[PDB]
Design a protein around this ligand. Sequence first.
Ligand code: HEM
Length: 136
Amino acid sequence: LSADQISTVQASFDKVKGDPVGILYAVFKADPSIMAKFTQFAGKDLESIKGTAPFETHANRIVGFFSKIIGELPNIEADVNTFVASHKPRGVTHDQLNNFRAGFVSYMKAHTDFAGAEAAWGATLDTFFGMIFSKM
Ligand code: HEM
């Protein structure tokens, strides 16, 4: 993960970072068991809560932190540590994490011309999820 790839990803992310709700929707849609961990969304129709204020609040926090991480590549260790601290005790599994990844990439493919940033994103996400999976 070098500056060339980092600059590519960050340019790519800048195009979509204003749509937190869209990104979280794509993740929840890829894996409903992620949605079922939120007391505020469990048992509801995803298509119906997508436009409500609670969804947006959550989406802004979650994609907000991801944004922090993308902004500081590649010095992400301390933030991954924080993520693991808050999420390890909620029982998040490797499956769910990989579905988060899949949902995000699906979002990125359906909203941008992704083919030009795909290898850089691959490097980034392999690095990030590589660190998470070593810790939880
Ligand atoms: C994919 C599996 C994941 C599951 C099952 C999960 C689950 C949750 C749950 C249950 C909450 C608490 C919401 C609330 O009580 O209001 C939450 C909050 C949060 N999540 Fe995750 N999350 C996942 C992935 C991620 C990822 C990849 C990030 C990185 C951006 C992230 C960042 C956050 C942040 C910043 C919060 C707010 C602070 C907190 O309460 O932890 N989550 N998530």
